[PDB]
Amino acid sequence: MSFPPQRYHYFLVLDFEATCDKPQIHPQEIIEFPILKLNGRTMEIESTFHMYVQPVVHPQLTPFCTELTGIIQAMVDGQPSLQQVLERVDEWMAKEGLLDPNVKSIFVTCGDWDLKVMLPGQCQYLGLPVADYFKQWINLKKAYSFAMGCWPKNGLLDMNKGLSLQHIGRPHSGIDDCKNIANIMKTLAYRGFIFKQTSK
Ligand SMILES: Nc1ncnc2c1ncn2[C@@H]1O[C@H](COP(=O)(O)O)[C@@H](O)[C@H]1O
Ligand SMILES: [Mg+2]
Ligand SMILES: [Mg+2]
Protein backbone atom coordinates (compact mmCIF):
# COMPACT_ATOMS: atom_id res chain seq x y z
CA MET A 1 0.00 0.00 0.00
CA SER A 2 1.42 3.33 -1.15
CA PHE A 3 1.44 6.04 1.58
CA PRO A 4 0.08 3.85 4.39
CA PRO A 5 -1.27 5.33 7.61
CA GLN A 6 1.60 6.40 9.83
CA ARG A 7 2.06 6.44 13.58
CA TYR A 8 2.63 10.21 13.80
CA HIS A 9 0.54 13.24 12.80
CA TYR A 10 3.79 15.06 11.89
CA PHE A 11 7.46 14.40 11.30
CA LEU A 12 9.96 17.15 12.29
CA VAL A 13 13.02 16.93 10.01
CA LEU A 14 16.14 18.40 11.62
CA ASP A 15 19.77 18.67 10.49
CA PHE A 16 22.19 20.94 12.34
CA GLU A 17 25.25 22.60 11.05
CA ALA A 18 27.97 23.31 13.61
CA THR A 19 31.30 25.10 13.90
CA CYS A 20 34.10 22.84 12.69
CA ASP A 21 37.73 22.85 11.59
CA LYS A 22 40.56 20.56 10.42
CA PRO A 23 41.36 18.87 12.88
CA GLN A 24 38.00 19.23 14.55
CA ILE A 25 37.24 22.31 16.67
CA HIS A 26 36.47 21.77 20.35
CA PRO A 27 33.79 22.29 21.47
CA GLN A 28 31.59 22.39 18.40
CA GLU A 29 28.62 24.70 18.50
CA ILE A 30 25.36 24.75 16.56
CA ILE A 31 25.28 27.51 13.92
CA GLU A 32 22.21 26.52 11.89
CA PHE A 33 18.97 25.23 13.36
CA PRO A 34 16.45 24.03 10.73
CA ILE A 35 13.21 22.13 11.27
CA LEU A 36 10.78 21.05 8.55
CA LYS A 37 7.30 20.06 9.68
CA LEU A 38 6.03 17.27 7.39
CA ASN A 39 2.47 16.11 7.15
CA GLY A 40 2.54 12.67 8.73
CA ARG A 41 0.69 10.87 5.96
CA THR A 42 1.90 12.51 2.74
CA MET A 43 5.36 13.74 3.91
CA GLU A 44 4.62 17.14 2.36
CA ILE A 45 6.41 20.09 3.99
CA GLU A 46 3.88 22.29 5.78
CA SER A 47 6.06 24.65 7.80
CA THR A 48 9.68 25.55 8.31
CA PHE A 49 11.63 26.83 11.29
CA HIS A 50 15.03 28.21 10.35
CA MET A 51 17.52 30.24 12.36
CA TYR A 52 21.20 30.71 12.20
CA VAL A 53 22.79 30.70 15.64
CA GLN A 54 25.62 32.87 16.97
CA PRO A 55 28.48 30.72 18.29
CA VAL A 56 30.00 31.96 21.56
CA VAL A 57 33.05 29.80 22.51
CA HIS A 58 34.59 30.01 19.01
CA PRO A 59 32.73 32.99 17.63
CA GLN A 60 34.64 33.39 14.33
CA LEU A 61 33.74 30.80 11.67
CA THR A 62 36.84 29.02 10.37
CA PRO A 63 37.63 28.94 6.63
CA PHE A 64 36.96 25.25 6.67
CA CYS A 65 33.54 25.72 8.29
CA THR A 66 32.49 28.36 5.76
CA GLU A 67 33.76 26.17 2.89
CA LEU A 68 31.98 23.08 4.24
CA THR A 69 28.60 24.65 5.10
CA GLY A 70 28.45 27.78 2.95
CA ILE A 71 27.62 29.71 6.11
CA ILE A 72 29.47 33.04 6.18
CA GLN A 73 30.29 35.11 9.27
CA ALA A 74 27.60 37.70 8.48
CA MET A 75 24.94 35.00 8.69
CA VAL A 76 25.76 34.25 12.39
CA ASP A 77 26.80 37.74 13.57
CA GLY A 78 23.99 39.45 15.49
CA GLN A 79 22.03 36.22 15.79
CA PRO A 80 20.68 34.93 19.10
CA SER A 81 22.68 32.24 20.82
CA LEU A 82 21.51 28.68 21.27
CA GLN A 83 19.68 29.39 24.52
CA GLN A 84 17.47 31.93 22.74
CA VAL A 85 17.02 29.79 19.63
CA LEU A 86 15.75 26.92 21.75
CA GLU A 87 13.19 29.32 23.24
CA ARG A 88 12.21 30.31 19.70
CA VAL A 89 11.78 26.63 18.82
CA ASP A 90 9.46 26.15 21.80
CA GLU A 91 7.36 29.06 20.65
CA TRP A 92 7.30 27.71 17.10
CA MET A 93 6.27 24.27 18.38
CA ALA A 94 3.47 25.88 20.38
CA LYS A 95 2.16 27.92 17.44
CA GLU A 96 2.32 24.88 15.12
CA GLY A 97 0.14 22.95 17.54
CA LEU A 98 2.84 20.35 18.34
CA LEU A 99 2.70 20.75 22.11
CA ASP A 100 -0.71 19.04 22.31
CA PRO A 101 -0.30 15.57 23.89
CA ASN A 102 -2.86 14.25 21.41
CA VAL A 103 -0.85 15.56 18.40
CA LYS A 104 1.86 12.94 17.90
CA SER A 105 5.15 14.07 16.33
CA ILE A 106 8.77 12.89 16.20
CA PHE A 107 12.09 14.35 15.02
CA VAL A 108 13.81 12.73 12.05
CA THR A 109 17.57 13.10 11.53
CA CYS A 110 20.21 11.61 9.22
CA GLY A 111 22.18 9.64 11.85
CA ASP A 112 21.96 9.95 15.58
CA TRP A 113 24.63 12.67 15.93
CA ASP A 114 22.28 15.70 16.06
CA LEU A 115 20.12 14.69 19.04
CA LYS A 116 22.28 11.99 20.63
CA VAL A 117 25.51 13.99 20.66
CA MET A 118 25.41 17.59 19.33
CA LEU A 119 22.40 19.14 21.07
CA PRO A 120 22.65 17.37 24.48
CA GLY A 121 26.41 17.97 24.53
CA GLN A 122 26.07 21.73 23.94
CA CYS A 123 23.11 22.06 26.32
CA GLN A 124 25.13 20.28 29.02
CA TYR A 125 28.09 22.58 28.38
CA LEU A 126 25.79 25.61 28.68
CA GLY A 127 23.79 24.27 31.65
CA LEU A 128 20.54 24.25 29.65
CA PRO A 129 17.74 21.70 29.99
CA VAL A 130 16.93 19.75 26.79
CA ALA A 131 13.25 19.88 25.87
CA ASP A 132 11.59 16.50 26.06
CA TYR A 133 10.51 16.48 22.42
CA PHE A 134 14.21 16.34 21.47
CA LYS A 135 14.67 13.09 23.38
CA GLN A 136 13.08 10.73 20.83
CA TRP A 137 13.80 10.55 17.15
CA ILE A 138 14.03 8.46 14.00
CA ASN A 139 17.47 7.84 12.53
CA LEU A 140 16.74 7.88 8.79
CA LYS A 141 19.75 5.67 8.02
CA LYS A 142 18.32 3.00 10.28
CA ALA A 143 14.81 3.45 8.89
CA TYR A 144 16.17 3.27 5.35
CA SER A 145 17.99 0.06 6.26
CA PHE A 146 14.70 -1.59 7.33
CA ALA A 147 12.80 -0.18 4.33
CA MET A 148 15.40 -1.24 1.78
CA GLY A 149 17.12 -4.16 3.51
CA CYS A 150 20.56 -2.50 3.20
CA TRP A 151 22.92 -0.13 5.04
CA PRO A 152 23.72 3.11 3.16
CA LYS A 153 27.41 3.92 3.12
CA ASN A 154 27.47 7.76 3.03
CA GLY A 155 24.26 9.21 4.44
CA LEU A 156 21.89 11.25 2.31
CA LEU A 157 24.01 10.97 -0.83
CA ASP A 158 23.87 7.20 -0.91
CA MET A 159 20.22 7.09 0.17
CA ASN A 160 19.28 9.35 -2.77
CA LYS A 161 21.39 7.08 -5.03
CA GLY A 162 19.62 3.95 -3.83
CA LEU A 163 16.21 5.53 -4.53
CA SER A 164 17.17 7.24 -7.81
CA LEU A 165 16.49 10.69 -6.42
CA GLN A 166 18.24 13.87 -7.53
CA HIS A 167 19.97 15.70 -4.72
CA ILE A 168 18.08 18.83 -3.56
CA GLY A 169 20.20 21.92 -3.09
CA ARG A 170 23.72 22.09 -1.58
CA PRO A 171 25.20 19.28 0.63
CA HIS A 172 25.98 20.43 4.21
CA SER A 173 23.46 23.24 4.11
CA GLY A 174 21.19 22.44 7.07
CA ILE A 175 17.93 23.40 5.39
CA ASP A 176 18.84 21.63 2.14
CA ASP A 177 19.81 18.49 4.01
CA CYS A 178 16.34 18.66 5.60
CA LYS A 179 14.65 18.83 2.20
CA ASN A 180 16.53 15.68 1.07
CA ILE A 181 15.51 13.83 4.26
CA ALA A 182 11.94 14.88 3.54
CA ASN A 183 12.24 13.71 -0.08
CA ILE A 184 13.75 10.33 0.92
CA MET A 185 10.99 9.91 3.52
CA LYS A 186 8.29 10.63 0.97
CA THR A 187 9.73 7.92 -1.32
CA LEU A 188 9.99 5.35 1.52
CA ALA A 189 6.32 6.05 2.29
CA TYR A 190 5.42 5.70 -1.37
CA ARG A 191 7.01 2.23 -1.28
CA GLY A 192 4.81 1.40 1.75
CA PHE A 193 7.13 1.93 4.71
CA ILE A 194 5.71 2.78 8.14
CA PHE A 195 8.17 4.83 10.21
CA LYS A 196 9.07 3.96 13.80
CA GLN A 197 11.10 5.60 16.53
CA THR A 198 14.65 4.21 16.51
CA SER A 199 16.19 6.16 19.42
CA LYS A 200 16.67 4.12 22.58
N1 LIG B 1 34.11 16.30 6.50
C1 LIG B 1 33.93 16.93 7.68
N2 LIG B 1 34.92 17.40 8.39
C2 LIG B 1 34.78 18.07 9.56
N3 LIG B 1 33.58 18.32 10.12
C3 LIG B 1 32.47 17.88 9.49
C4 LIG B 1 32.56 17.15 8.22
N4 LIG B 1 31.31 16.89 7.78
C5 LIG B 1 30.47 17.37 8.77
N5 LIG B 1 31.19 17.98 9.77
C6 LIG B 1 30.61 18.63 10.97
O1 LIG B 1 29.36 18.01 11.23
C7 LIG B 1 28.28 18.98 11.10
C8 LIG B 1 27.02 18.30 10.56
O2 LIG B 1 27.32 17.60 9.36
P1 LIG B 1 26.34 17.44 8.14
O3 LIG B 1 24.87 17.29 8.53
O4 LIG B 1 26.89 16.34 7.29
O5 LIG B 1 26.49 18.78 7.39
C9 LIG B 1 28.88 20.06 10.20
O6 LIG B 1 28.18 21.33 10.31
C10 LIG B 1 30.32 20.13 10.69
O7 LIG B 1 30.38 20.81 11.95
MG1 LIG C 1 23.68 16.19 9.55
MG1 LIG D 1 23.75 18.98 7.47
Coordinates of N, CA and C and ligand atoms in Angstrom, one line a residue:
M1 N 0.8 -1.2 0.0 CA 0.0 0.0 0.0 C 0.9 1.2 0.0
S2 N 0.7 2.1 -1.0 CA 1.4 3.3 -1.1 C 0.9 4.3 -0.1
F3 N 1.8 5.1 0.5 CA 1.4 6.0 1.6 C 0.5 5.5 2.6
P4 N 0.9 4.4 3.3 CA 0.1 3.9 4.4 C -0.2 4.9 5.5
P5 N -1.1 4.6 6.4 CA -1.3 5.3 7.6 C 0.0 5.2 8.4
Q6 N 0.4 6.3 9.0 CA 1.6 6.4 9.8 C 1.2 6.5 11.3
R7 N 2.3 6.4 12.1 CA 2.1 6.4 13.6 C 2.1 7.8 14.2
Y8 N 2.4 8.8 13.4 CA 2.6 10.2 13.8 C 1.8 11.1 12.9
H9 N 1.2 12.2 13.6 CA 0.5 13.2 12.8 C 1.6 14.1 12.0
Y10 N 2.8 14.3 12.6 CA 3.8 15.1 11.9 C 5.2 14.5 12.1
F11 N 6.0 14.7 11.1 CA 7.5 14.4 11.3 C 8.2 15.7 11.3
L12 N 9.2 15.9 12.2 CA 10.0 17.1 12.3 C 11.4 16.9 11.8
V13 N 11.7 17.2 10.6 CA 13.0 16.9 10.0 C 14.0 18.0 10.5
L14 N 15.1 17.5 11.1 CA 16.1 18.4 11.6 C 17.5 18.0 11.1
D15 N 18.4 19.0 10.8 CA 19.8 18.7 10.5 C 20.7 19.9 10.8
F16 N 21.4 19.8 11.9 CA 22.2 20.9 12.3 C 23.4 21.1 11.4
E17 N 23.8 22.4 11.3 CA 25.2 22.6 11.0 C 25.9 23.1 12.3
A18 N 27.2 22.9 12.4 CA 28.0 23.3 13.6 C 29.3 23.9 13.2
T19 N 29.9 24.7 14.1 CA 31.3 25.1 13.9 C 32.2 23.9 13.7
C20 N 33.2 24.0 12.9 CA 34.1 22.8 12.7 C 35.4 23.4 12.2
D21 N 36.4 22.5 12.0 CA 37.7 22.8 11.6 C 38.5 21.5 11.2
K22 N 39.7 21.7 10.7 CA 40.6 20.6 10.4 C 41.8 20.8 11.2
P23 N 42.2 19.9 12.2 CA 41.4 18.9 12.9 C 40.2 19.5 13.6
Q24 N 39.3 18.7 14.1 CA 38.0 19.2 14.6 C 38.1 20.3 15.7
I25 N 37.2 21.3 15.7 CA 37.2 22.3 16.7 C 36.6 21.7 17.9
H26 N 37.0 22.3 19.1 CA 36.5 21.8 20.4 C 36.2 22.9 21.3
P27 N 35.0 23.1 21.8 CA 33.8 22.3 21.5 C 33.2 22.8 20.2
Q28 N 32.4 21.9 19.6 CA 31.6 22.4 18.4 C 30.3 23.1 18.9
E29 N 29.8 24.0 18.1 CA 28.6 24.7 18.5 C 27.7 24.8 17.3
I30 N 26.4 24.7 17.6 CA 25.4 24.7 16.6 C 25.3 26.1 15.9
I31 N 25.4 26.2 14.6 CA 25.3 27.5 13.9 C 24.1 27.6 13.0
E32 N 23.4 26.5 12.7 CA 22.2 26.5 11.9 C 21.2 25.5 12.5
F33 N 20.0 26.0 12.6 CA 19.0 25.2 13.4 C 17.7 25.2 12.5
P34 N 17.6 24.2 11.6 CA 16.5 24.0 10.7 C 15.5 22.9 11.2
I35 N 14.2 23.2 11.1 CA 13.2 22.1 11.3 C 12.2 22.2 10.2
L36 N 11.9 21.1 9.5 CA 10.8 21.0 8.5 C 9.7 20.2 9.2
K37 N 8.5 20.8 9.2 CA 7.3 20.1 9.7 C 6.7 19.4 8.5
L38 N 6.6 18.1 8.5 CA 6.0 17.3 7.4 C 4.7 16.7 7.9
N39 N 3.7 16.9 7.0 CA 2.5 16.1 7.2 C 2.8 14.6 7.3
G40 N 2.1 14.0 8.3 CA 2.5 12.7 8.7 C 2.2 11.6 7.7
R41 N 1.2 11.8 6.9 CA 0.7 10.9 6.0 C 1.4 11.0 4.6
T42 N 1.4 12.3 4.1 CA 1.9 12.5 2.7 C 3.4 12.9 2.7
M43 N 4.0 13.3 3.8 CA 5.4 13.7 3.9 C 5.6 15.1 3.2
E44 N 4.5 15.8 2.9 CA 4.6 17.1 2.4 C 5.0 18.1 3.4
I45 N 5.9 19.1 3.1 CA 6.4 20.1 4.0 C 5.3 21.1 4.2
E46 N 4.9 21.3 5.5 CA 3.9 22.3 5.8 C 4.4 23.5 6.5
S47 N 5.5 23.4 7.2 CA 6.1 24.7 7.8 C 7.5 24.5 8.0
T48 N 8.2 25.6 8.2 CA 9.7 25.6 8.3 C 10.1 26.5 9.5
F49 N 10.9 26.0 10.3 CA 11.6 26.8 11.3 C 13.1 26.9 10.8
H50 N 13.6 28.1 10.8 CA 15.0 28.2 10.3 C 15.7 29.4 11.0
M51 N 16.7 29.2 11.8 CA 17.5 30.2 12.4 C 19.0 29.9 12.3
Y52 N 19.8 30.9 11.9 CA 21.2 30.7 12.2 C 21.4 31.1 13.6
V53 N 22.6 30.6 14.2 CA 22.8 30.7 15.6 C 24.2 31.3 15.8
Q54 N 24.3 32.2 16.7 CA 25.6 32.9 17.0 C 26.5 32.0 17.9
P55 N 27.6 31.5 17.4 CA 28.5 30.7 18.3 C 29.2 31.7 19.3
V56 N 29.5 31.1 20.5 CA 30.0 32.0 21.6 C 31.4 31.5 22.0
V57 N 31.7 30.2 22.1 CA 33.0 29.8 22.5 C 34.1 30.1 21.4
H58 N 33.8 29.7 20.2 CA 34.6 30.0 19.0 C 33.8 30.9 18.1
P59 N 33.7 32.2 18.3 CA 32.7 33.0 17.6 C 33.0 33.3 16.2
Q60 N 34.3 33.1 15.7 CA 34.6 33.4 14.3 C 34.6 32.1 13.6
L61 N 33.8 32.0 12.5 CA 33.7 30.8 11.7 C 35.1 30.6 11.0
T62 N 35.6 29.3 11.0 CA 36.8 29.0 10.4 C 36.6 28.9 8.9
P63 N 37.7 29.1 8.1 CA 37.6 28.9 6.6 C 37.0 27.6 6.2
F64 N 37.5 26.6 6.9 CA 37.0 25.3 6.7 C 35.4 25.2 6.9
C65 N 35.0 25.8 8.0 CA 33.5 25.7 8.3 C 32.7 26.4 7.2
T66 N 33.2 27.6 6.8 CA 32.5 28.4 5.8 C 32.5 27.6 4.4
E67 N 33.7 27.0 4.1 CA 33.8 26.2 2.9 C 32.8 25.0 3.0
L68 N 32.8 24.3 4.1 CA 32.0 23.1 4.2 C 30.5 23.4 4.1
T69 N 30.0 24.4 4.9 CA 28.6 24.7 5.1 C 28.0 25.8 4.2
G70 N 28.9 26.6 3.7 CA 28.5 27.8 3.0 C 28.0 28.9 3.9
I71 N 28.1 28.7 5.2 CA 27.6 29.7 6.1 C 28.7 30.7 6.3
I72 N 28.5 32.0 6.0 CA 29.5 33.0 6.2 C 29.3 33.7 7.5
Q73 N 30.3 34.5 7.9 CA 30.3 35.1 9.3 C 29.1 36.0 9.4
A74 N 28.7 36.8 8.4 CA 27.6 37.7 8.5 C 26.3 37.0 8.7
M75 N 26.2 35.7 8.4 CA 24.9 35.0 8.7 C 24.8 34.7 10.2
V76 N 25.9 34.6 11.0 CA 25.8 34.3 12.4 C 25.9 35.5 13.3
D77 N 26.7 36.5 12.8 CA 26.8 37.7 13.6 C 25.4 38.3 13.8
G78 N 25.2 38.9 15.0 CA 24.0 39.5 15.5 C 22.9 38.5 15.7
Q79 N 23.1 37.2 15.6 CA 22.0 36.2 15.8 C 21.9 35.9 17.3
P80 N 20.8 35.4 17.7 CA 20.7 34.9 19.1 C 21.6 33.7 19.3
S81 N 21.9 33.4 20.5 CA 22.7 32.2 20.8 C 21.7 31.1 21.0
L82 N 22.3 29.9 21.3 CA 21.5 28.7 21.3 C 20.4 28.7 22.3
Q83 N 20.7 29.3 23.5 CA 19.7 29.4 24.5 C 18.4 30.1 24.0
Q84 N 18.6 31.2 23.3 CA 17.5 31.9 22.7 C 16.8 31.2 21.6
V85 N 17.6 30.5 20.8 CA 17.0 29.8 19.6 C 16.2 28.7 20.1
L86 N 16.6 28.0 21.2 CA 15.8 26.9 21.8 C 14.4 27.5 22.3
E87 N 14.4 28.7 22.8 CA 13.2 29.3 23.2 C 12.3 29.7 22.0
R88 N 13.0 30.1 20.9 CA 12.2 30.3 19.7 C 11.6 29.0 19.2
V89 N 12.3 27.9 19.3 CA 11.8 26.6 18.8 C 10.5 26.3 19.6
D90 N 10.6 26.4 21.0 CA 9.5 26.2 21.8 C 8.2 27.0 21.4
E91 N 8.5 28.2 21.1 CA 7.4 29.1 20.7 C 6.8 28.6 19.3
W92 N 7.7 28.2 18.4 CA 7.3 27.7 17.1 C 6.5 26.4 17.3
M93 N 7.0 25.5 18.1 CA 6.3 24.3 18.4 C 4.9 24.6 18.9
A94 N 4.8 25.5 19.8 CA 3.5 25.9 20.4 C 2.5 26.4 19.3
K95 N 3.0 27.3 18.5 CA 2.2 27.9 17.4 C 1.8 26.9 16.4
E96 N 2.6 25.9 16.1 CA 2.3 24.9 15.1 C 1.3 23.9 15.7
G97 N 1.1 23.9 16.9 CA 0.1 23.0 17.5 C 0.8 21.7 18.0
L98 N 2.1 21.6 18.1 CA 2.8 20.4 18.3 C 3.0 20.1 19.8
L99 N 2.6 21.0 20.7 CA 2.7 20.8 22.1 C 1.4 20.1 22.7
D100 N 0.4 19.8 21.9 CA -0.7 19.0 22.3 C -0.3 17.6 22.5
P101 N -0.5 17.0 23.7 CA -0.3 15.6 23.9 C -1.0 14.7 22.9
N102 N -2.2 15.1 22.4 CA -2.9 14.3 21.4 C -2.4 14.4 20.0
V103 N -1.5 15.4 19.7 CA -0.8 15.6 18.4 C 0.5 14.8 18.5
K104 N 0.7 13.8 17.7 CA 1.9 12.9 17.9 C 2.9 13.4 16.9
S105 N 4.1 13.7 17.3 CA 5.1 14.1 16.3 C 6.5 13.5 16.8
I106 N 7.4 13.4 15.9 CA 8.8 12.9 16.2 C 9.8 13.6 15.3
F107 N 11.0 13.8 15.9 CA 12.1 14.4 15.0 C 12.7 13.2 14.2
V108 N 13.2 13.6 13.0 CA 13.8 12.7 12.1 C 15.1 13.4 11.7
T109 N 16.2 12.6 11.8 CA 17.6 13.1 11.5 C 18.3 12.1 10.7
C110 N 19.3 12.5 10.0 CA 20.2 11.6 9.2 C 21.4 11.2 10.2
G111 N 21.3 10.1 10.8 CA 22.2 9.6 11.8 C 21.6 9.9 13.2
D112 N 22.3 9.6 14.2 CA 22.0 10.0 15.6 C 22.7 11.2 16.1
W113 N 23.7 11.6 15.4 CA 24.6 12.7 15.9 C 23.9 13.9 16.5
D114 N 22.9 14.4 15.7 CA 22.3 15.7 16.1 C 21.7 15.7 17.5
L115 N 20.8 14.7 17.8 CA 20.1 14.7 19.0 C 20.7 13.7 20.1
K116 N 21.6 12.8 19.6 CA 22.3 12.0 20.6 C 23.6 12.6 21.1
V117 N 24.2 13.5 20.3 CA 25.5 14.0 20.7 C 25.5 15.5 20.6
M118 N 25.2 16.1 19.5 CA 25.4 17.6 19.3 C 24.6 18.4 20.3
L119 N 23.2 18.3 20.2 CA 22.4 19.1 21.1 C 22.5 18.8 22.6
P120 N 22.4 17.6 23.0 CA 22.6 17.4 24.5 C 24.0 17.8 25.0
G121 N 25.1 17.6 24.1 CA 26.4 18.0 24.5 C 26.6 19.5 24.7
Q122 N 26.0 20.3 23.8 CA 26.1 21.7 23.9 C 25.2 22.2 25.1
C123 N 24.0 21.7 25.2 CA 23.1 22.1 26.3 C 23.8 21.7 27.7
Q124 N 24.5 20.6 27.8 CA 25.1 20.3 29.0 C 26.3 21.3 29.3
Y125 N 27.0 21.6 28.3 CA 28.1 22.6 28.4 C 27.5 23.9 28.9
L126 N 26.4 24.3 28.4 CA 25.8 25.6 28.7 C 25.0 25.6 30.0
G127 N 24.7 24.4 30.5 CA 23.8 24.3 31.6 C 22.3 24.4 31.3
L128 N 21.9 24.0 30.1 CA 20.5 24.3 29.6 C 19.8 22.9 29.7
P129 N 18.5 22.9 30.1 CA 17.7 21.7 30.0 C 17.4 21.4 28.5
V130 N 17.4 20.1 28.1 CA 16.9 19.8 26.8 C 15.4 19.5 26.8
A131 N 14.7 20.1 25.9 CA 13.2 19.9 25.9 C 12.9 18.4 25.6
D132 N 11.8 17.9 26.1 CA 11.6 16.5 26.1 C 11.3 16.0 24.6
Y133 N 10.8 16.9 23.8 CA 10.5 16.5 22.4 C 11.8 16.2 21.6
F134 N 13.0 16.6 22.2 CA 14.2 16.3 21.5 C 14.8 15.0 21.9
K135 N 14.1 14.3 22.8 CA 14.7 13.1 23.4 C 14.3 11.8 22.7
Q136 N 13.4 11.9 21.6 CA 13.1 10.7 20.8 C 13.2 11.1 19.4
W137 N 13.7 10.2 18.6 CA 13.8 10.6 17.2 C 13.9 9.3 16.3
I138 N 13.8 9.5 15.0 CA 14.0 8.5 14.0 C 15.3 8.7 13.3
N139 N 16.2 7.8 13.3 CA 17.5 7.8 12.5 C 17.1 7.3 11.1
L140 N 17.1 8.3 10.2 CA 16.7 7.9 8.8 C 17.6 6.8 8.2
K141 N 18.9 6.8 8.5 CA 19.8 5.7 8.0 C 19.3 4.3 8.5
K142 N 18.8 4.2 9.7 CA 18.3 3.0 10.3 C 17.0 2.7 9.7
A143 N 16.1 3.7 9.5 CA 14.8 3.4 8.9 C 15.0 3.0 7.5
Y144 N 15.9 3.7 6.7 CA 16.2 3.3 5.4 C 16.6 1.8 5.3
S145 N 17.5 1.4 6.3 CA 18.0 0.1 6.3 C 16.9 -1.0 6.4
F146 N 15.8 -0.7 7.2 CA 14.7 -1.6 7.3 C 13.8 -1.6 6.1
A147 N 13.6 -0.4 5.5 CA 12.8 -0.2 4.3 C 13.4 -0.8 3.1
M148 N 14.7 -0.8 3.0 CA 15.4 -1.2 1.8 C 16.2 -2.5 2.0
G149 N 16.3 -3.0 3.2 CA 17.1 -4.2 3.5 C 18.6 -4.0 3.4
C150 N 19.1 -2.7 3.4 CA 20.6 -2.5 3.2 C 21.1 -1.2 3.9
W151 N 22.3 -1.2 4.3 CA 22.9 -0.1 5.0 C 23.5 0.9 4.1
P152 N 23.1 2.1 4.0 CA 23.7 3.1 3.2 C 25.1 3.4 3.6
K153 N 26.0 3.7 2.7 CA 27.4 3.9 3.1 C 27.6 5.4 3.6
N154 N 27.3 6.3 2.7 CA 27.5 7.8 3.0 C 26.1 8.5 3.0
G155 N 25.3 8.3 4.1 CA 24.3 9.2 4.4 C 23.3 9.5 3.3
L156 N 22.9 10.8 3.2 CA 21.9 11.3 2.3 C 22.3 11.0 0.9
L157 N 23.6 11.1 0.6 CA 24.0 11.0 -0.8 C 23.7 9.5 -1.3
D158 N 24.1 8.6 -0.5 CA 23.9 7.2 -0.9 C 22.4 6.8 -0.8
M159 N 21.6 7.4 0.1 CA 20.2 7.1 0.2 C 19.5 7.6 -1.1
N160 N 19.8 8.9 -1.5 CA 19.3 9.3 -2.8 C 19.7 8.4 -3.9
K161 N 20.9 8.0 -4.0 CA 21.4 7.1 -5.0 C 20.6 5.8 -5.1
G162 N 20.4 5.2 -3.9 CA 19.6 4.0 -3.8 C 18.2 4.1 -4.4
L163 N 17.6 5.3 -4.2 CA 16.2 5.5 -4.5 C 16.0 6.3 -5.8
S164 N 17.1 6.5 -6.5 CA 17.2 7.2 -7.8 C 16.6 8.6 -7.7
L165 N 17.0 9.3 -6.6 CA 16.5 10.7 -6.4 C 17.6 11.7 -6.7
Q166 N 17.3 12.8 -7.3 CA 18.2 13.9 -7.5 C 18.4 14.6 -6.2
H167 N 19.7 15.0 -5.9 CA 20.0 15.7 -4.7 C 19.3 17.1 -4.8
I168 N 18.7 17.5 -3.7 CA 18.1 18.8 -3.6 C 19.1 19.8 -3.0
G169 N 19.4 20.9 -3.7 CA 20.2 21.9 -3.1 C 21.7 21.5 -2.9
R170 N 22.3 22.1 -1.9 CA 23.7 22.1 -1.6 C 24.0 21.1 -0.4
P171 N 24.8 20.1 -0.6 CA 25.2 19.3 0.6 C 25.8 20.1 1.8
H172 N 25.5 19.7 3.0 CA 26.0 20.4 4.2 C 25.4 21.8 4.4
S173 N 24.4 22.2 3.7 CA 23.5 23.2 4.1 C 22.4 22.6 5.0
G174 N 22.1 23.1 6.2 CA 21.2 22.4 7.1 C 19.8 22.3 6.5
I175 N 19.3 23.4 5.9 CA 17.9 23.4 5.4 C 17.9 22.5 4.2
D176 N 18.9 22.5 3.3 CA 18.8 21.6 2.1 C 19.0 20.2 2.6
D177 N 19.8 19.9 3.5 CA 19.8 18.5 4.0 C 18.4 18.1 4.5
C178 N 17.7 19.0 5.1 CA 16.3 18.7 5.6 C 15.4 18.3 4.4
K179 N 15.5 19.1 3.4 CA 14.6 18.8 2.2 C 15.0 17.5 1.6
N180 N 16.2 17.0 1.6 CA 16.5 15.7 1.1 C 16.0 14.6 2.0
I181 N 16.1 14.8 3.3 CA 15.5 13.8 4.3 C 14.0 13.7 4.0
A182 N 13.4 14.9 3.8 CA 11.9 14.9 3.5 C 11.6 14.1 2.3
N183 N 12.4 14.4 1.2 CA 12.2 13.7 -0.1 C 12.5 12.2 0.0
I184 N 13.5 11.8 0.7 CA 13.7 10.3 0.9 C 12.6 9.7 1.7
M185 N 12.1 10.4 2.7 CA 11.0 9.9 3.5 C 9.8 9.7 2.7
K186 N 9.5 10.7 1.8 CA 8.3 10.6 1.0 C 8.3 9.4 0.1
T187 N 9.5 9.1 -0.5 CA 9.7 7.9 -1.3 C 9.6 6.6 -0.5
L188 N 10.2 6.5 0.7 CA 10.0 5.3 1.5 C 8.5 5.1 1.8
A189 N 7.8 6.2 2.1 CA 6.3 6.1 2.3 C 5.6 5.6 1.0
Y190 N 6.0 6.2 -0.1 CA 5.4 5.7 -1.4 C 5.6 4.2 -1.5
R191 N 6.8 3.7 -1.2 CA 7.0 2.2 -1.3 C 6.3 1.4 -0.2
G192 N 5.6 2.1 0.8 CA 4.8 1.4 1.7 C 5.4 1.3 3.2
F193 N 6.4 2.0 3.4 CA 7.1 1.9 4.7 C 6.4 2.7 5.8
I194 N 6.3 2.1 7.0 CA 5.7 2.8 8.1 C 6.9 3.1 9.1
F195 N 7.0 4.4 9.4 CA 8.2 4.8 10.2 C 8.0 4.5 11.7
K196 N 9.1 4.3 12.4 CA 9.1 4.0 13.8 C 10.2 4.7 14.5
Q197 N 10.0 5.1 15.7 CA 11.1 5.6 16.5 C 12.2 4.6 16.5
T198 N 13.5 5.1 16.4 CA 14.6 4.2 16.5 C 15.5 4.6 17.7
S199 N 15.4 5.8 18.3 CA 16.2 6.2 19.4 C 15.8 5.3 20.6
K200 N 16.8 5.1 21.5 CA 16.7 4.1 22.6 C 16.3 4.8 23.9
Ligands
LIG1 N1 34.1 16.3 6.5 C1 33.9 16.9 7.7 N2 34.9 17.4 8.4 C2 34.8 18.1 9.6 N3 33.6 18.3 10.1 C3 32.5 17.9 9.5 C4 32.6 17.2 8.2 N4 31.3 16.9 7.8 C5 30.5 17.4 8.8 N5 31.2 18.0 9.8 C6 30.6 18.6 11.0 O1 29.4 18.0 11.2 C7 28.3 19.0 11.1 C8 27.0 18.3 10.6 O2 27.3 17.6 9.4 P1 26.3 17.4 8.1 O3 24.9 17.3 8.5 O4 26.9 16.3 7.3 O5 26.5 18.8 7.4 C9 28.9 20.1 10.2 O6 28.2 21.3 10.3 C10 30.3 20.1 10.7 O7 30.4 20.8 12.0
MG2 MG 23.7 16.2 9.5
MG3 MG 23.7 19.0 7.5

